Structure formats: structure tokens, C-alpha cells
Structure 1
Amino acid sequence: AHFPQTPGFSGTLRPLRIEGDILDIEIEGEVPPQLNGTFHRVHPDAQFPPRFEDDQFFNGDGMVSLFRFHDGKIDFRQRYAQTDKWKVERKAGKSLFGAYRNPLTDDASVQGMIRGTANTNVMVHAGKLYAMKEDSPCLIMDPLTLETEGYTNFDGKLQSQTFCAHPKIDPVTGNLCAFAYGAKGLMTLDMAYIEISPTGKLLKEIPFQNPYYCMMHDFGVTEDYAVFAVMPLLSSWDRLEQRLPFFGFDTTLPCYLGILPRNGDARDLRWFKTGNCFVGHVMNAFNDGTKVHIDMPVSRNNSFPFFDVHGAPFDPVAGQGFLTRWTVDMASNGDSFEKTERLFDRPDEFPRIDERYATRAYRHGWMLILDTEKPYEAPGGAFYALTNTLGHIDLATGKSSSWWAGPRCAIQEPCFIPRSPDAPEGDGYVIALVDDHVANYSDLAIFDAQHVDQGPIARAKLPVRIRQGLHGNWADASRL
């Protein structure tokens, strides 16, 4: 009823909190008639006002959106993920859990509960929808009704208390390749590489130890290795008692890259070391023999201003991430990299690939671009987190193109859809939410993947603006 009038809950970040349905969205243009599948997507949307006036973006309850493609039509369905947190807070009619990653600020009635909001990523696997949040197990939902089944441990087999929100689909085995940090609770170095079969059975859970008490948000998977990028985004329980941000970036410590053979154990894990930097989302990773490549935006400090870290304001220029390839060789001796190479010279994040080529050699990528030289005429919005541009890069040529959403709009994470199962790499479509911050409408815009610069070929016009979310995924109807 009464949300704190902090910027975190006002203007373009106002609460939405509407579950609902639209049958047959209004289309401007023509939805590609062959497309038949689901595009899932999630945003934080605190059900009730927070205990803390300062409660953060990534702490809001997960609101899941479904866009079902079929017969040149798109349907809309949106539901709260009914996490243990969400269920108990609804019964109380108020928020019971506290600050971000801080159980010391929880109400006494919910101590020991799973504090996850399932607000970071949603992906179809094993005929179900996996709703994910780092600090908590995987939440199982129905891909079409968006009903919540409950957290899972994969029939008692998984020991890890947590489950990452950035798994990859092995394009050969169809296995869900995931991982977990803090696998034995907050502030533990216990890690795990996880593979889930196409029918939901836990196949392997390879434990190992991390170099830091740090955040491990994303990782890479190659044909033979799991790739873990370790940054000094450090955590400490002292900070929670002082009521400071759980994570704080240390600009003096180095970064590591851990290569775990997917068929080995912690004994075979080799650590490589490089200079200090901030590592973003992994576009893709792949190995050529013992040569391992991983592509991700690299910046000098935190790239997300909604992500409150401790110490040293928010440097918006030091937070500019550029798509960078890291290369190590398992055949070499020592912990030296072979190569670091900037792949793209514009600040970017939220990278995407033709997922048929995940874990393999590839050339086509899409990304959100921060074009600060463009006007932004929408009052009530952070100019910092303004992804106003969609970009495409041909890594084989370095050529790139982009599209500007205009001065009224932001763009959310894109997603690639192939034109057909055996279409060439990157031949198909890119979809993304384009949010008009003046009229408060959202379009699910459809681009030609190879000509994003020509603007959308179609727009699914929603009569509502979807709150800025995180990650989404496309699944063909055959996966259901």
C-alpha cells in the first residue's frame, strides 16, 4: 500500500506487482509464422513494501513472464514465483525477510528459511521451468501455467544448498550444466559443478574450493571443461553485522580463471591468474584442444549501479564493460594466461548467442549497449542503468551493427531464435522488451538477427510497461 518513495521504488522503477493474462497480444507488423515456443523472463517485484527503505533491486520477489509463440500469435501470462519467502510473507500480509543476503535482518519467524526470490533467471529444462536465484536452491514451476511446485534437490541427490542462475544447455547431451557457490551456506568456499540430465536426474556434483569468499554469478562451459571466473567481489559476515552491502569489490587483489575438466574432480582443477578487473556475464565459452576461451564484458569496477557494493562511490566510467576474450592453455605450465583481447569497443552487457552453439566455437553475439551520447527524455529514471541500444557483433570479422531505441525507451535482455532447426548460425530473430518510459508501455520487439540496425520487424504491443527485469530464455515447443 505504502512503498518507500526512494528512487528504488519510484519513477520507471515503480512497483508493478500485477499477475495476469492477455490472449493474443496486439501485433504491429507480422510475427514470424513458423515460430512455436516459449520466451520466459523474470523481474524483481516486491510483493509488499520492504522492511528497509533501502531494500534493493535484486531483492524483490520474482515475477515471471511467459510469451507463448504460435501461429503468428503471442500470448502473455505473468505470475509471481511462489517461493517459500513469498508464501509466508503473503500469509502475513507484510514483508518478513530483510536486506539483501543478510539473515541477521530477517524477522524471527522466518529464521532458517530459504530466502530466495527466484528473480534472476527462468529456463525450460526437463519439461519444467527452472526459476533460479544464487543464494537458494532451484525453484520448479510449470512452463505454461507458471504455477510453482517448490524448491528441488533432484530427489535428494543434490547436496548443494544453492543453485546458480546461469546454467548452460550442452548442445550434444542436452544436459543442464550448472554450478553453485556458497554450497554449504553463506560465506563458505564450497563450490560444485552440476550436470542435470534431460529428464531431471542429477548426473554429477563435483565439489571444489574457491580462492575467495566471493560472488560467482556466471561461468563458462566448454566441450571438455567448466570455466569459473573468480573476481575479488568479496563478502564478509562483519559487513552484515555492521549492516553494509554484503559484497565489496577489492581493487588490489588479482582475478583467477579455474578450469575444471567436466569428467574429473577437484584434483584436476587448474587455476590461472590475471590482473584485477570486474567480470560480467559470459557470452560463451569453448575449448580448442587444451586451449580454453571465454568471452565476457570486463570492466575496472562494478558495472551495475543498481548493484550496491561497498566503498568507492559508483564510478560510471570504471564500470564500463567491454566484451573481452580470455585464453588459457591446459597444456602449459604455470598460471599465466595466453591472451586477453577486447572484442568490442563499446560499453556492453547482457550478451547472447545462438544457443545451438553454446559451449562450442561461435561467431555471432548480441548485446545491450550503453550509448550515453544519446538523449534520454524520460523523467524518473536512472541515466546509469540505461541500456538504450541493441547490438550485434560478428566475431569472425569484428564487424558490428546496432539499433537505438530512441530517447523515450530502454531495452531489456535480448534473446535469439533460429529461423529453423538447421538454419545457419545466427540466422533467425532477436527478441527483446523495449520499454517506453514516458507512455509506460512495453513492446516485445522482434528483430532480424542479422539486421538489428533496421529496427524491429514486429512489435507485440503490451498495454502495460514491464518492470526492468534480468534474464530470459527461448525454448522451442518441442521442449515441452
Structure 2
Amino acid sequence: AHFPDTPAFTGFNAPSRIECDIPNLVHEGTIPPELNGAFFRVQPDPQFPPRLGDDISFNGDGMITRFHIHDGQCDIKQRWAKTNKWKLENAAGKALFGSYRNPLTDDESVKGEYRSTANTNAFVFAGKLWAMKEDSPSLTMDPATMETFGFEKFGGKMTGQTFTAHPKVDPLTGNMVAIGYAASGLCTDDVCLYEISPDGELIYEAWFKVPYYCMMHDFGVTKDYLVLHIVPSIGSWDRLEKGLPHFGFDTTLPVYLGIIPRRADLKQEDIRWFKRENCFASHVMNAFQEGTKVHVDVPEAENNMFPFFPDVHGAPFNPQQAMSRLTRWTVDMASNSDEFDSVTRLTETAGEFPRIDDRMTGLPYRYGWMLEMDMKRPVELKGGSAGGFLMNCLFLKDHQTGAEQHWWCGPTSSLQEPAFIPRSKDAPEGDGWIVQVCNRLADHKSDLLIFEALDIEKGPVATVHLPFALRFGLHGNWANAEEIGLAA
């Protein structure tokens, strides 16, 4: 393959495309014998060179990595998420779909097809592996063989065109709660709220509209509500016609927080929209209710975090203003005005990729983990981030005491998103382990790190070496072996 000599395709961003199997990876330390299951994660990784001769990181085909941990060892299986895009391009031997979220640039032969790269999450639910991309229905895969099933349209009961890559599982019911924005077509203001039974059946789909079309990448869920931030990374057909990146950030638009009832009978009039001054937030650590209030914890930045989705008025990217810090947004459903009740920074550590013990989804909670950008640490090698942030620490916040733990990966490495592994179904919050990929940039390889989740400062208890490098990853999740067809 002849790939471009551009940053999106060179160095740490060289295409990999490895499908492989390796049991019993070389490792150091002690892999807890308690562990029996697998950590799935996804990297964008281009099957073919881009039609345009350049592209962005977020547009690579999804490659799924599974780390099966069992018997004190770690195995890897890596396979493509075989989206319709992947299959059509594989058959043609070339790229057919064009630039990011831009159907104007697709070959005529794929007009109307799902454009998904299934590249943003590798999530386990209802016995399936979900390889997810927010512009289409999710792909599903067999979590044991990692063969691909196809797109999940729930027996035709789903009528929205899209499905999120940030599904939540409600611990009270076991339902998956999801959204799909641009639900009636590209750049539309329609959104669907979906709930899916533990057995994989669509329970309901509820339609509503948002203040403006924007990247609705993540969201929170509480007992009663979908908690949907409206942040002005905006797109339009006009941008696409002009050849601009689909999304661009508008510093002049307000940010909203929508509180949408989790009800099949939802009507637009049931929604409350709270409004605040412009800022940027993407991911949600968790949301929960307290009395008539809703709290959602997000890494908030002063301005855009996506340099490749630039300021719509032509401003150069501002890295300092892109530093996000975990912040609690509180709204009161009983409040008279549309103002937020409070906005409260929860840490001065800058960070992103927030995670919780997912048993606490929607509930008051004590612990959160993040990737931290610690700009005071030495750096001899940089890499691993699509936007150029160096994620060099694992951070744990204790909301009860305020305490913070930090673990730095050293001066030639960077880190990928952590994932929490509960010790058992009924173990206390945070009792378990954290796993995450570490980019060993000087060695051009990756490790899987395993930490005791509440004692990270001493470093990982096991380090699993991969004999090759993973690419930049997005989201990942642990599932116990019995949830994924792997051995007891």
C-alpha cells in the first residue's frame, strides 16, 4: 500500500493493520489469578490509503484488540470490525468512502451505504461485542471468535439512522441506554434515545430535537434522565460543500445541558434545556441525581479540543485553552430560569478519558479515573494523541476525601484510556483493577498495564508486553469471561 507522507500516516500513526493471535504474551509482575475475562479496545487503522491523499485520525477503520486475561496470563487476539465499508473496500481493493463524515466525497458506488468505521468503542453487552461509530447503527461481533455479524438495527424496530459509541448500562435494570444524533439524516437536529434490554432487544426509541446540530459524542444517564450536553462543535452541509472538515468549533454559541426523561412517551415539551456560556466538553465521567438536581461530571475546557475540527472563524488552535479539567455541572429541575445551578471544578489536574466503576453509572459515586496531561513532567518522546496532548499519567480522584493519586508512565511513554474491572458483582465501589494500554514510544511497542485500582501510585502490578505497537485508541471495556463466551 502507498500511504501519504503526512502526520496522520507516519511515525506513531503508521498504519498497522495487524490481525494476529498470541497467547501467553511476555509479561512481568503478577497478573492477579482472580482475573478471568477480556479487555476490548479499538484503534482507528486504515485498511486502505485515503481517497483524498490525506485524512484525520478519527477516520481510520476500526481494528479491535482483545486482551484475554486468565490463569495469570494475557493473550491477544486482534481483528478488524468488518463494517459494510470495510467489506466493500476490501472487495474493491481500494478506498471508496472519502473524508470524515462527508458523503459528498464518496465514490458513487457507495452512495447511501453506512459510512461507519466502527472505530470508537469496543463494548460488551447482551453477549455481543459492539464496535461502535456514532454516524451509523453499531456493528456487532462475536466476542469469542471476533467474527463480525453486521449492523444492529434491532429487528427493524430502530428507525433512527445512527447509534452512539458511548452506551451506558443502567445498574438498576441492566438496560443499555444509548442515543443516536443526526437521527433523520446528516446534520439534522433530531436525536433518538434508545434503551435495550439485557437480552439485546430494543425496548423503546424516543425522538426529540436539540437546540442545534453538533457533535453529540457522549452523554450521561441517571435513574430518570438522559443528560445531554450541547457543545458547539458544529457541522453543516455547507461546510462539506466548501471542503471544510465536517465539524468546527464556534466560540460564540451557548452551551446547553438537556435533561430528557427516560420515557418511551417522551415529548419535546418534557425536556428542560439549561444554558451556559461557551466552553468545550466531550466526555462524561458520570451523572447522577440528588433531590431535584442533576449533576454531571465532565472534563471542561475553555475552548475546542479538536485541532482538526478548527475554529469556525479562523482562529488558530489554542492548546492552553484546550486543557480540560474535571468539572461538575449541576442543574436543578425545579429552578425557574435556564441557568445552571453551579459549575464547580473538581480538580486542578488537567485530564480527559474519564472512567468510573461502571456499576455506579447514574449513581452518586466516589471514584473516578482519568488520563492526565501533567505538563511539568519531563518528556523525551511525544506521541499517542490525535490532537497532540501528551497523556502521561494515570489519575484517580476520590470525591469523598478529595484525595488524588497519580502514576507517571515515564519520559518516553504515553497512556491510553483506562478501564475498570470489578472484583465481583457485589464488591464495593472501586474494588478491583484498572487496565490500560501504554505506548512505549521509544521501543515502538505497547504494554498492557494492570493496576490495583485504588493503589495506582505504586505502579502496575503486572506489565504485559506486546511485541508490536498498537495505534492511538479510543474506548475500551472489560467483560468477565462468562459474558463473552470464554472459559470459566
So what's the TM-score if we normalise by structure 2?
0.96
Deviation at 1:12, TM superposition (A): 1.0
Task: Determine the structure 2 residue equivalent to 1:295.
Answer: 297
Structure 1 CA distance, aligned partners of 2:281 and 2:380?
Answer: 31
Structure 2 CA distance, aligned partners of 1:307 and 1:3?
Answer: 22
Q: Does residue 394 of structure 2 align to residue 393 of structure 1?
A: no
Q: Give 1:123-134 correspondences, 5 Å limit.
A: 123-134=123-134
Greater displacement, 293-302 / 257-266 = 257-266
Q: Does residue 68 of structure 2 align to residue 65 of structure 1?
A: no
Task: Determine the structure 2 residue equivalent to 1:324.
Answer: 327
Structure 2 CA distance, aligned partners of 1:315 and 1:282?
Answer: 22
Structure 2 CA distance, aligned partners of 1:75 and 1:308?
Answer: 40
Deviation at 1:248, TM superposition (A): 1.3
Q: Give 1:202-241 correspondences, 5 Å limit.
A: 202-241=202-241
Q: Is contact 1:57–1:306 with CA below 8 Å preserved after alignment? A: no
Q: Secondary structure at the match of 2:154?
A: coil
Task: Determine the structure 2 residue equivalent to 1:464.
Answer: 468
Task: Determine the structure 1 residue equivalent to 2:85.
Answer: 85
Q: Is contact 1:246–1:309 with CA below 8 Å preserved after alignment? A: no
Deviation at 1:385, TM superposition (A): 2.6
Q: Is contact 1:304–1:385 with CA below 8 Å preserved after alignment? A: no
Structure 1 residues 156 and 179, CA, compared in 2 at 3 Å: closer, same or farther?
A: same
Task: Determine the structure 2 residue equivalent to 1:265.
Answer: 266
Letter in 2 for 1:56: I
Letter in 2 for 1:119: N
Letter in 1 for 2:304: N
| Structure 2 unaligned blocks of 5 or more | none
Q: Does residue 380 of structure 2 align to residue 374 of structure 1?
A: no
| Structure 1 unaligned blocks of 5 or more | none
Q: Secondary structure at the match of 1:239?
A: helix
Deviation at 1:334, TM superposition (A): 2.2
> Could you list the runs of 4 or more consecutive aligned residues of structure 1 that deviate by over 6 angstroms after TM superposition?
379-383
Structure 2 CA distance, aligned partners of 1:187 and 1:58?
Answer: 18
Letter in 1 for 2:397: I
Letter in 2 for 1:464: F
Q: Give 1:57-456 correspondences, 5 Å limit.
A: 57-263=57-263, 264-266=265-267, 267-305=269-307, 310=312, 311-378=314-381, 384-456=388-460
Q: Secondary structure at the match of 1:50?
A: coil
Q: Secondary structure at the match of 1:114?
A: coil
User: What are the superposed Cα offsets for residues 289-325 of structure 1, whole Å, 9 maximum, x if unpaired?
Assistant: 3210000001111224455564322210010011000
Letter in 1 for 2:407: W
Structure 2 CA distance, aligned partners of 1:289 and 1:159?
Answer: 34
Q: Is contact 2:281–2:300 with CA below 8 Å preserved after alignment? A: yes
User: What are the superposed Cα offsets for residues 247-289 of structure 1, whole Å, 9 maximum, x if unpaired?
Assistant: 1111111111111121351331111111110012000001123
Structure 2 CA distance, aligned partners of 1:459 and 1:144?
Answer: 24
Q: Is contact 1:219–1:227 with CA below 8 Å preserved after alignment? A: yes
Identical pairs, percent: 57
User: What are the superposed Cα offsets for residues 166-187 of structure 1, whole Å, 9 maximum, x if unpaired?
Assistant: 0101112110000010001101
Structure 2 CA distance, aligned partners of 1:379 and 1:394?
Answer: 29
Deviation at 1:379, TM superposition (A): 6.6
Structure 1 CA distance, aligned partners of 2:384 and 2:341?
Answer: 42
Deviation at 1:376, TM superposition (A): 2.2
Deviation at 1:234, TM superposition (A): 1.2
CA RMSD between the two structures: 1.4
Structure 1 CA distance, aligned partners of 2:261 and 2:291?
Answer: 12
Structure 2 CA distance, aligned partners of 1:450 and 1:152?
Answer: 37
Deviation at 1:238, TM superposition (A): 1.0
Letter in 2 for 1:441: K
Letter in 2 for 1:265: L
User: What are the superposed Cα offsets for residues 336-380 of structure 1, whole Å, 9 maximum, x if unpaired?
Assistant: 211110011121000010111111110100000011222222277
Structure 2 CA distance, aligned partners of 1:306 and 1:232?
Answer: 15
Q: Is contact 1:223–1:359 with CA below 8 Å preserved after alignment? A: yes
Task: Determine the structure 2 residue equivalent to 1:9.
Answer: 9
User: What are the superposed Cα offsets for residues 388-428 of structure 1, whole Å, 9 maximum, x if unpaired?
Assistant: 11100001121101111111111000011122332221122
Q: Is contact 1:322–1:342 with CA below 8 Å preserved after alignment? A: yes
